[PDB]
Design an enzyme around this catalytic site. Sequence first.
Site, short mmCIF file in Angstrom:
data_model
loop_
_atom_site.label_atom_id
_atom_site.label_comp_id
_atom_site.label_asym_id
_atom_site.label_seq_id
_atom_site.Cartn_x
_atom_site.Cartn_y
_atom_site.Cartn_z
N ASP A 265 0.85 -1.18 0.00
CA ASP A 265 0.00 0.00 0.00
C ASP A 265 0.89 1.23 0.00
OD1 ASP A 265 -1.95 1.92 0.16
OD2 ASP A 265 -3.01 1.02 1.85
N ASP B 4 -2.99 -2.64 -2.63
CA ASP B 4 -3.92 -1.68 -2.04
C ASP B 4 -3.53 -0.27 -2.48
OD1 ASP B 4 -5.78 -0.29 -0.52
OD2 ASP B 4 -5.46 -1.49 1.28
N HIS C 207 -0.04 -0.57 4.86
CA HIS C 207 -0.53 0.79 5.00
C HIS C 207 0.00 1.43 6.28
CE1 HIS C 207 -3.31 4.17 4.47
NE2 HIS C 207 -3.52 4.09 5.78
MG LIG Z 1 -3.25 2.96 2.01
#
Ligand SMILES: [Mg+2]
Length: 733
Positions: free
Chosen positions: A506, A576, A708
């Site tokens: 991500d 992502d 993330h």
């Molecule tokens: Mg993200």
Amino acid sequence: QRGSSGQPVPVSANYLPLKGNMDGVFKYAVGFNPPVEDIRSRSQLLNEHKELIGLTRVFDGSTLYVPKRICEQRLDLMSTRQTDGASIKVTISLVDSVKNRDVVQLMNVIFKRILRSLKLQRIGRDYYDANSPLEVPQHKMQLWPGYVTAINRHEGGLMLVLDVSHRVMKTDTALDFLYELYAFKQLVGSVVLTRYNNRTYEIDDIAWDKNPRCAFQDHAGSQITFVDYYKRAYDLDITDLEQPLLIHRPKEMVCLVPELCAMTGLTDAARSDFKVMKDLAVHTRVPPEKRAESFRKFIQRLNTTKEASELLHSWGLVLDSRMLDMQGRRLPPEKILFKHSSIVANMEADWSRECLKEHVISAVSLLDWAVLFVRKDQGKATDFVNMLSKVCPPIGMEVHEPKMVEVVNDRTESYLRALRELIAPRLQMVVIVFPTSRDDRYSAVKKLCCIESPIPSQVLIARTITQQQKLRSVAQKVALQMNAKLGGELWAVEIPLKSCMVVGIDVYHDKSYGNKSIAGFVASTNPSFTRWYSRTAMQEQSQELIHELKLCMQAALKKYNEMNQSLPERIIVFRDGVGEGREEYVSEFEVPQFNSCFSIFGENYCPKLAVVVVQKRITTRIFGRSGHSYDNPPPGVIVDHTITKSYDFYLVSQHVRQGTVSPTYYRVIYDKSGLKPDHLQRLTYKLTHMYYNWPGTIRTPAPCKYAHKLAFLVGKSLHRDPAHELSDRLFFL
RNA sequence: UUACCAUCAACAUGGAAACUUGGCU
RNA sequence: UCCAUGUUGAUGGUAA
Ligand SMILES: [Mg+2]
Ligand SMILES: [Mg+2]
């Protein structure tokens, strides 16, 4: 794309199926040799011979769509307009509609005109209702429902994606607001709309020097007063004589009288009132049943108007009367594992209660560790340490008396000095208790504890350790997080896929630190997916950043080689952060880089890659149907057909106690693993449990959320590449 | 910064904005 | 003149 795993469950989505047959529609080009500036001029040019151009036309720049084939394919008309005319060269030419990408746009324009064929007026893209308000007669407010619709193409044909929204409103006049306000920002920001001529007007400037006695030339004739104007137009009176006036100028001037106006939106004082927002939350947070009710009322309104229906009939497309109903399937609940014990997950898919009292798999004896705080926060830290002593033996960890170090004062410099003094080879974890929430101090502390002298650390605030009757769960959560930040695993799930190294990526888009666009790479290392290897790629380029990702993949693969004495047969990359604008870039640019340099580790070593894109935002909402009742589906429901476009699926994995659960959308852009679609769906479901921060299920798979969080920590606080001593741990939870 | 999820306001850089009756001031 | 992609305040819920 089909798979049969669980038990069938009837569900319904908010998709109105449009049985729309576009036959005889062809993009006719009219054009002319001498250009004409006005679009209205071209529209009137068409309307002049509209008897031959048709009574139902779509013209938005000479891309004339008419519903039926013209008798003569090539028809030439020369005509003269009003100003000079210039001998316009109107000539019909044919272009095919085969590609069908124009069909969706034609659908959109005709359906916009169909929506306005009703009496729904527009305050934006949405067409808000003005006949069925949701009265809130205590704040004098008022809620208008409205709809946003977007025709799209799915596996079942054309679907009207539909979603309802609410636009707030007041009933006291503008002069009542000015009464109670005895400023500029609130009035200017508000979008005042008059009731008699129900259309939205935007106020940009106020002039406290005008009045109703002022004169405006009406119909390009003589001067009239605003009181007279409104008396002769709409049969009403205005009482005030020296009130302000509001100026609206489009992109000449329009003078609104602030007694007939009715402010919209929420004012700052109205928002600040807790009761107002609490009341409006009930209406705004719509359960599935009320959302379905609004949907059904919209279908009935479309059906029974007889004006919109005529236009539908004219363009030759049929509309259906009930929201889409399909037969999904619910995957079985998952047996969560512990040390010599197991628990079947609830229908809610949450096992916090069993986690609090069951033995974790791997525990690290927290022998040497230290606590850091200011003098003002002594007792709270001591009480927290006592509760960590209390709650750990139940779950397995053997926690010893940490060390006790105080800092001179609250400034970041003293914390940094204390950390530089304290860190030793033997010390395992540093606990730092911040009296407040200051971003720069957190950044500096994490810089010292993740770059310079890397040691996993736990920062916590003096807010979440002072409220008694809640410190027990706080301690039981911090204890699990501490075990996570040491190489120990908490729980496990039965995963029937041998040698499948799972990857999660991500990217943290941000224009804060040089628009660096930090990335995050996380890779599993054991057959049970309980240990992870984390790297980050920070680069100011869209090309060499993928070379850093190549290096990250190579390092993760060799880490797996060391930790398992072999190499993975499969690699699955759950990607992502890719929205809808930049979906293609992964499929054709990033993926071949992964495919390219895997030959350095073995003789023709080509692991069977498979890339999956994760979208957490969608306009699809899925309800489970029991009898004639609509309710949120349980976690673990798959919808893989009739609303999916190209080898993708919708997974319901979160449990939400307020409103409608939003499913998560998974595409497989690149598939070479050889796994059946069913096993990929089941793997994506199982990975949802593997996030240690929350016992239960989450929206995205655990690797994506880990990536993330790593990217977020590196981009917001560290602004640098963290040390390599912390890669095998989860030091960012 | 103990965590996860539903709504909703401001500050950044992706489109756009025509119909229609012509007609708000 | 509005909605998207977002970056952030203040509201809600949960946790024996
Ligand atoms: Mg993200
Ligand atoms: Mg932490």
